[PDB]
Amino acid sequence: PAHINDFMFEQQRRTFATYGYALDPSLDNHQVSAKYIGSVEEAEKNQGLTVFETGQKKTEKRKKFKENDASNIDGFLGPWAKYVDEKDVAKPSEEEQKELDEITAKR
Amino acid sequence: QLSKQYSSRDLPSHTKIKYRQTTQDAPEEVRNRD
Amino acid sequence: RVALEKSVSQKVAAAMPVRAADKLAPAQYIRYTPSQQGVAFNSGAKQR
Amino acid sequence: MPKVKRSRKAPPDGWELIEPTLDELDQKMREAETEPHEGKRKVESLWPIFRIHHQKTRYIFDLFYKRKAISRELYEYCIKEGYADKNLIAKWKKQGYENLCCLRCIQTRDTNFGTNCICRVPKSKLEVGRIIECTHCGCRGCS
Amino acid sequence: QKEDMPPEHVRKIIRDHGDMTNRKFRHDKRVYLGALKYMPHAVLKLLENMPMPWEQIRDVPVLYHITGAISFVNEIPWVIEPVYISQWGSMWIMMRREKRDRRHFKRMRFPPFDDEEPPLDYADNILDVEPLEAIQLELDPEEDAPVLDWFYDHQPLRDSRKYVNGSTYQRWQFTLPMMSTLYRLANQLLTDLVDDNYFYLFDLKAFFTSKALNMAIPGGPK
Amino acid sequence: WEDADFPILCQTCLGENPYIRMTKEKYGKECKICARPFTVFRWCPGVRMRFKKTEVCQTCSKLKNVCQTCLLDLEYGLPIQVRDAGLSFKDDMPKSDVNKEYYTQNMEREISNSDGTRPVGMLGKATSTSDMLLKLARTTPYYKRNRPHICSFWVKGECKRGEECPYRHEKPTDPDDPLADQNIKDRYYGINDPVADKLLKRASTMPRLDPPEDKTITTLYVGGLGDTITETDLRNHFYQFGEIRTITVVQRQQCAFIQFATRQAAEVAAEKSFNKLIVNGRRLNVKWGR
Amino acid sequence: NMLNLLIHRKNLNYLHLDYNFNLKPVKTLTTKERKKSRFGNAFHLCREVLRLTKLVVDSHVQYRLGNVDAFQLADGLQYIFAHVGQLTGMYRYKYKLMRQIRMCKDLKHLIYYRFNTGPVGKGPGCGFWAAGWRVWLFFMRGITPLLERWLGNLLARQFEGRHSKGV
Amino acid sequence: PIMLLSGHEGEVYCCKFHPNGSTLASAGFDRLILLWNVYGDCDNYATLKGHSGAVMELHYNTDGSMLFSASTDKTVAVWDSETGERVKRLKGHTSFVNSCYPARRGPQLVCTGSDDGTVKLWDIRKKAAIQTFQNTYQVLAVTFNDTSDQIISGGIDNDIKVWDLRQNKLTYTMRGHADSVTGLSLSSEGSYLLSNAMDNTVRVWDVRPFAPKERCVKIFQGNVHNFEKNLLRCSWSPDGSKIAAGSADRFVYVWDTTSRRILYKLPGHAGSINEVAFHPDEPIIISASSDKRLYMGEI
RNA sequence: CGGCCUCCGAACGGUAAGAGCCUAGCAUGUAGAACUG
Ligand SMILES: O=P(O)(O)O[C@H]1[C@@H](OP(=O)(O)O)[C@@H](OP(=O)(O)O)[C@@H](OP(=O)(O)O)[C@@H](OP(=O)(O)O)[C@H]1OP(=O)(O)O
Ligand SMILES: [Zn+2]
Ligand SMILES: [Zn+2]
Ligand SMILES: [Zn+2]
């Protein structure tokens, strides 16, 4: 029943999630060094920045809309505003559709 | 495997033990007596 | 007296059945040492 | 036929220019309410209701605070008559919470680990751009 | 903190589920069932906040289950004592003068609905209709000035920290004009006694002695 | 019901991130083995990877020493039919309803007298993990396990939720495959697991050293020696494994030949040595010479 | 919904509970069904308490739908509370109710024979329902723990099973 | 015995003895300060109140009568151990005050390190600032010099610094720390200073009228850091003999000055040890750990 | 100067017990998923 703090575990988890590498946590009686585990060369080339700590990313932010006038009768997507580079209807290939009808026959 | 059934008789009741007081006959006076 | 009374009070709260529930206790933080050791799993760390 | 008015006191005098907006928003709230329970889903049929609610109260949030095109006492009447959302507003007034979608999206008790929805985490910290659907509102990154 | 919701939320869930026959819900089945153990709480709560015939609509805080299984009116109906007595005394005078001045009172029919006439939908039927003048009595503007506006309010002086301790609605302080007007108005449901030398052999202790001696006062209990 | 400290599952089922998050519910559901209420701990497997949950009583687990989520053994990680047979193991676990309930009850009684360290019974007296099991054992975390199902909507077209199809929107497997419908209870009972029969066919076709005809062929050719080897090193490879009679280390062909003093000793050394007698890193081939 | 789920989970298809909370069979019931379909004071006491509240709610629904009147509503409520004896039929499941029922008759007598002190007539136009309201509310204060215990036990025995093992 | 102490709402960050060794001070997140009897059964009597942020440093006087405490809520505070009630609220500190150091046997004064970018001197009497050396960054550790004429500080530049109280410029800067400076402690010699750092290496120096101008004398291996980056604190023995340290491995580190061997790496703990207190009279140790308790080891 | 005014109704105990038989429901919503010189 170790006792740790959490905010640092949550920062570690944010990193290990969105950057893919993690500060290795093993608390061995063999004194290891602070090492980046997971996507090692990713953390190395990224200088170890965690998903929480601010750092510069020229990553293309996914294309979004913005209708913020709540006076429009049919307007306000507001906080719910769709990302504009998204499809309308998620329809899977006609191929798998015909094959799925066929399999629903097969059973 | 502890059930949730229950009973009218197992409701809490008589929840303090009357301890035998000083004048009635406490184990102290029994320690003494001849 | 001590161990007795604890087991008593658990069996007694059994006859509560309407538990006026207490809330959920503080979160558990546990250190796990797998017996499986190896560079490939846990992506290379000896503890979680 | 409207949200029939209880106070019996006369609405203060900026009501007449939010009048048709409020009326229309109520009508389409009614319609999106009776909108029946399709093969749609059961978790996802409670998004439009918060959409319309947040819609209306944002409208009034502008028309009192960002324009000052309305009287204090009118807008008070229009909360007390259940169009607006006094608590949503008193939070919206915060620094990081301008677009908080549904006032349940920050309820810390509403979730097992004691957090908010990922609907609240700013997308820059996510960096993964996977469409985020907060179950409650359906909303898309309110913050 | 835990915060309120639009009413249409619950209303949608509940008219959605209806009577749990649709295979869609199919798990709130068992939760619905398990909610039966508390149905006698819901009923006591509902019935102790009923709307007190001079008001046409009363709104109350409602706590409910995220699948609509149960709905506890979460409120305790505090009232100010002389306020309450005076209002019901007004009711007394109105009922008597009215049934005297009415040509023939009709008795409504119970059950008011038929056995398989399902319960009606609130919104779709009763939400918007006009609520039908209540049993208000008309107080005199000179005689009853100190109250004339706030009398028949659901919780009258709810918001005036000059009169009410707060938004919890306790600990009231009142003006003597107010009090004398009220007194005069609740004059009907009241005792025209000034002291206790009336109840000489007619009080709790006399009755306790009687009960113990198996004797009976002429007009007292046995 | 039972009460736990944490689950029991392999690394694959167990996860990758250093900080794992799992929620507990006491008396959450019914072990399809012990049939009774268990605790349920639910673990977040991977990024957009299906949250798993503990799926067997901890005693139902310590019984056969397998994974309470991954369902495969915890030492090797092959089907339980396989691992048992690879120990030559033969468990008498009862099957019928009353028989099984009586068995489970006395089993929990007998396991209550344990210290929580290792499975009960023959699970230790079969701990000679045969190189057959070692070789059938997977090497890296086959982390395809935490990918979702086939989004039946997305199989017909319908999965209109965008990318949030709750399931991998791929081509659904033709259930004609024996690797498709393996009833969890049967997989636990070691009852006709077609994946286990596949492991049997694989560990039957996998290369092992061959036997010769006449008993008097006691010369054994080890192919692929190299010039870092010694005759005493070939000996120490095949010396106390019996007695050797002679050894020819062919340096003009990079091989060896052990003439033995016990035929079964030769068999032990060579058959255990097939392609895996790795002293100083050279893949030798153990056969019976001409 | 709760009570109907209870029936139909018990698999009693031949009984149906209608909307004024009367329980009515749709067949002729054999013995085995006559017996399997018996219910006890828990089920029936809820049924009848729900029936009282439904009658109250539905007088109020008539008023707000607009059919009746404020005065007609008040008089109807007074009725309901004085005549709980012949509307519901709860006394048959907790015969200790007649405490309450005698209390509401005594109030009725007091109120009426002071109410018609003058020209006022001895007819229906009297709704002054504070008193009987108090009475049945105290009755409810008392009955809620009892019914919670009985219904918890009914549900428990429904979902776990009855313990004929260690009686 | 073992004598594990408990009662804390959170992690225990700061622990020390009476400069008598009569009553014991511990504290951490909980924004109050627990005090105990060290002897007997290790009894827990009194709790100081008030400090809004986590009490980042407790500091006695050297006799044992007054109590200084630097709390993260922008303030240092003086209190009477006689009472437990605050004598001064040393405010003005523009950000998180980490460290406080009251001068021993000199006139009444404190040097304070904080999260602003300043080292600040303050007087107990004036409610006024005496000096402020802005190097450029937040100041994490401060210990005086035994003349109370230099101020030693450890911050974020790994470059251990000392100010002249009179010449007011950077008197001594010494370097060799592999990463940030986390703990300073002046031995009872008045001369040697002890410094821990998360970089796994801890250092000793000697601040004299003459030291070799490169005064990195003794170095100890074992201290750990992790993704927590919690505060690390160390001490000498009352005899300048045993080096006492905690760390984020759950091992309390006991070395000697002389052979610099591992005298102990003691387990027992569940939490990362955030402060070790040596007894001014006894072979008594109290280990304040992030497991929301303490230990009292006898050696 | 005398006053005195119980009550009140429902259930079980009566209209067999059975095995088979057959089919809705009702529950499940899971676990897994393959390899080389
Ligand atoms: O049995 P109950 O429910 O109480 O009601 C009736 C009735 O009541 P409603 O007017 O409420 O329908 C009359 O009572 P009053 O109105 O006269 O008070 C009546 O009185 P009479 O027939 O004497 O006119 C009668 O009395 P009883 O049954 O003793 O003959 C009796 O009221 P009570 O039962 O309350 O007496
Ligand atoms: Zn959300
Ligand atoms: Zn939301
Ligand atoms: Zn949102």
- Which of residues 64-83 of E have CB within 7 Å of strand I? none
Return residues with CB closer than 5 A to ligand 4 (ion): A 79; D 101, 105, 119, 139, 142
> How far apart (Å, rounded) are the C-alpha atoms in residues F261 and F269?
12
Residue H100's H or E segment, with its range, is: strand H97-102
What backbone phi and psi angles, to 5 degrees, belong to H283?
-85, 65
Angle at which helices G130-159 and G98-115 cross, to 10°? 160
Token pair in block for residue G118: 């003058």
The Cα-based distances of H195 to D99, H140, H161, H174 in angstroms read: 49, 12, 12, 12
User: What are the CA-CA distances from residue E40 to residues D135, E31, G141 (Å)?
Assistant: 33, 17, 10
Q: Residue H177: how many CB atoms within 10 A of its CB?
A: 22
Cβ contacts of F22 within 8 Å, gap of 6 or more: F6, F7, F41, F42, F43, F44
> Per the CB < 8 Å rule, is E108 touching G22?
no
Interface membership of A34 toward C (CB under 8 Å):
no
Q: Quick one: residue A74, left, alpha or beta (phi over 0 = left, psi -120 to 50 = alpha)? A: alpha
Contact with chain C for residue F16, Cβ under 8 A: yes
Task: Work out the minimum CA distance from C16 to partner chain F, whole angstroms.
Answer: 19
Return d(Cα H174, Cα H191) in angstroms, integer: 15
Ramachandran angles phi, psi of H42, nearest 5°: 60, 70
Please, what sign has the CA dihedral across residues E118, E123, E129, E134?
A: positive
Pocket of ligand 1, candidates G86, G88, G106, G108: which has the most ligand atoms within 8 Å of its Cβ, to mutate?
Answer: G108
CA of G157 to C1' of I24 (A): 26
How far is D37 from E11, CA to CA, in rounded Å? Answer: 13
Specified resolution (Å): 3.0
Contacts of D113 in chain F (CB under 8 A): 21, 23
Residue H256: phi and psi, rounded to 5, are -115, 155
**For the range F115-120, what are the long-range contacts, defined as Cβ-Cβ under 8 Å and sequence gap of 24 or more?**
F118/F62, F118/F65, F119/F62, F119/F63, F119/F64, F119/F65, F120/F62, F120/F63
The SS3 call for residue E114 is: coil
Which residues lie closer than 8 Å to H168 by C-beta, 6 or more apart? H131, H133
**Is the C-beta atom of F179 closer than 7 angstroms to strand I?**
yes
Q: How far apart are CA E200 and CA E86, in angstroms?
A: 29
Q: Distance from residue G71 (CA) to nucleotide I8 (C1'), in Å?
A: 32
Residues in G whose CB is inside 8 Å of some CB of B read 149, 152-153, 156-157, 160, 163
Question: Is D21 in contact with A83 (Cβ distance < 8 A)?
Answer: no
* C-alpha–C-alpha distance, residues D41 and D18, integer Å: 34
Strands (E) in chain G, as ranges, are 15-17, 23-25
Enter the tokens of residue H26: 């511990």
User: Among candidates G88, G139, H186, which has minimal Cα distance to E111?
Assistant: G88
Query: Using the 8-state DSSP alphabet, how is residue F246 labeled?
Result: E
* C27 to chain F: closest CA residue: F23
Residue nearest to nucleotide I16 (CA to C1'): G31
Contacts of F168 (CB under 8 A, 6+ apart): F147, F148, F149, F150, F151
Nucleotide nearest to F136 in CA–C1' terms: I35
Whose tokens are 């993260």? That residue is H72
d(C-alpha G44, C-alpha G22), whole Å: 10
What's the gap in Å between D48 CA and the centre of ligand 2?
Answer: 14
Strand, coil or helix: F273: helix
DSSP class per residue in H237-254? -TTS-EEEE--TTS-EEE
Minimum-distance residue to I33 (CA–C1'): F179
d(CA F256, CA F189): 47
Kindly state the tokens that stand for A101.
């009808």
What are the angstrom distances between the C-alpha of F250 and each of D21, D130, F93, F226, F247?
Answer: 98, 63, 54, 9, 9
Show the domain range for H99: 1-299
Residue bearing the CA closest to ligand 1, atom 31: G105
Contacts (Cβ under 8 Å, ≥6 apart) of A98: none
- Please name the member of C29, C43, C46 whose beta carbon is closest to the beta carbon of A4: C29
> Which E residues 30-49 have CB within 7 Å of strand I?
30
| Nearest CA distance, F187 vs chain B (angstrom) | 28
Q: CA distances (Å), E109 to each of C8, E65, E102, E112, G87, in order?
A: 57, 34, 19, 5, 12
Return the ligand number nearest the Cα of E105: 1
Q: Quick check: F227 and F259 in contact, CB under 8 A?
A: no
Query: Which nucleotide shows the minimum CA-to-C1' distance to residue F138?
Result: I35
Say how far D117 CA is from I32 C1', in Å: 31
DSSP for D41-110, written as a single string? -SSGGGHHHHHHHHHHHHHHHIIIIIS--S-HHHHHHHHHTTSS-HHHHHHHTSSS-TT---TTTT-STT
Instruction: Report how far residue H229's alpha carbon sits from residue H234's, in angstroms, rounded to the nearest whole number.
Output: 15
d(CA A79, CA D85) in angstroms, rounded, equals 16
Starting at the edge strand found earlier in the chain, the sheet holding H293-298 runs H4-6, H293-298, H284-289, H273-278
Task: Please say whether the beta carbons of D110 and D117 come within 8 A.
Answer: no
Q: Which residues contact F109 (CB under 8 A, 6 or more apart)?
A: none
D71 in reach of chain A (CB within 8 A): no
| Bridge partners (DSSP) listed for residue H284 | H298
Chain D contact residues (CB < 8 Å to E): 1-2, 4, 6, 29-30, 33-34, 37, 42, 45-46, 49-50, 53, 87, 103-104, 107, 109
DSSP conformation letters of H29-47: TTSSEEEEESSTTT-EEEE
G124 Cα nearest atom in ligand 1: 10
What does the DSSP 8-state code read for residue F190?
A: T
Amino acid at C14: A
Query: Whose CA is closest to F265, among F245, F241, F282?
Result: F241
- Contact call for residues G59 and G73 (beta carbons, < 8 A): yes
Residue G83 CA: which ligand 1 atom is closest? 3
- Going across the sheet that includes H192-197, the strands are H181-186, H192-197, H201-206, H219-221
Touching chains, B (3+ CB pairs < 8 A): C, F, G
Method of determination is cryo-EM
Q: Which H helix or E strand runs over G43?
A: helix G41-65
Structural domain harbouring D64: 1-143
Residue of chain C with shortest Cα separation from B4: C17
Burial (Cβ within 10 Å: 0-12, 13-18, ≥19) of residue F103: middle
Contacts of residue F72, defined as CB under 8 A and 6 or more positions apart, other chains included, come to F10, F66, F78, F79, F80
**Side chain identity, residue H154:** G
Q: Could you give the CA distance from residue D5 to residue E11 in angstroms, rounded to a whole number? A: 20
Amino acid at site A97? Q
For chain F, the 3-state helix, strand and coil shares in percent, each to the nearest 5, are: 30, 15, 55
Rounded Cα–Cα distance for residues E184 and E190 (Å): 10
Angle between helices E39-48 and G41-65 (to 10 degrees): 30
Helix (H) or strand (E) holding F156: helix F152-156
Interface of F with D (CB under 8 A): 21, 23, 48, 161-164
**Is the minimum CB–CB distance between D56 and chain A shorter than 8 Å?**
yes
The helix/strand/coil state of H179 is coil
**Summary count for chain G: helices (H), strands (E):** 7, 2
In Å, what is the CA distance from F224 to each residue of F21, F131, F210?
50, 22, 17
Q: What CATH number does the domain containing H65 carry?
A: 2.130.10.10
Ligand 1 centre and the CA of G11: distance in Å?
44
Interface of B with F (CB under 8 A): 1
- Quick one: angle between helices G70-82 and G98-115, nearest 10? 140
Yes or no, beta carbons of E40 and G4 under 8 Å apart: no
Spell out the residues 6+ positions from residue A95 whose beta carbon is closer than 8 angstroms to its own.
none
What residues of A are in contact with residue D124 (Cβ under 8 Å)?
57, 61
Terminal CA-CA length for chain D: 36
Q: In 3D, which of H269, C33, C44, F10 has the Cα closest to residue A28? A: C33
CA nearest neighbour of F62 among F128, F103, F18, F114: F114
Residues in chain C: 48
Based on the structure, what is the number of domains in chain H? 1
Q: Quick check: G162 CB within 7 A of strand I?
A: no
Longest Cα separation, chain F: 76
Q: Which CATH architecture has domain F219-288?
A: 2-Layer Sandwich (3.30)
Selection from H48, H28, H46, H27 nearest residue H36 by Cα: H46
Nucleotide nearest to G5 (CA to C1'): I26
Q: Which residues line ligand 1 (CB under 6 A)?
A: G 82-83, 105, 108-109, 112
Round to whole Å and give the CA distance between C28 and G157: 35
Could you give the CA distance from residue F154 to residue E57 in angstroms, rounded to a whole number? 50
Cα(H251)–Cα(H271) distance, rounded to whole angstroms? Answer: 9
Distance in angstroms: CA E215, C1' I4: 11
Strand I contact residues in chain G (92-111), C-beta within 7 Å: 92-93, 95, 98, 102
Question: Cα C11 to the chain's mean position, in Å?
Answer: 20
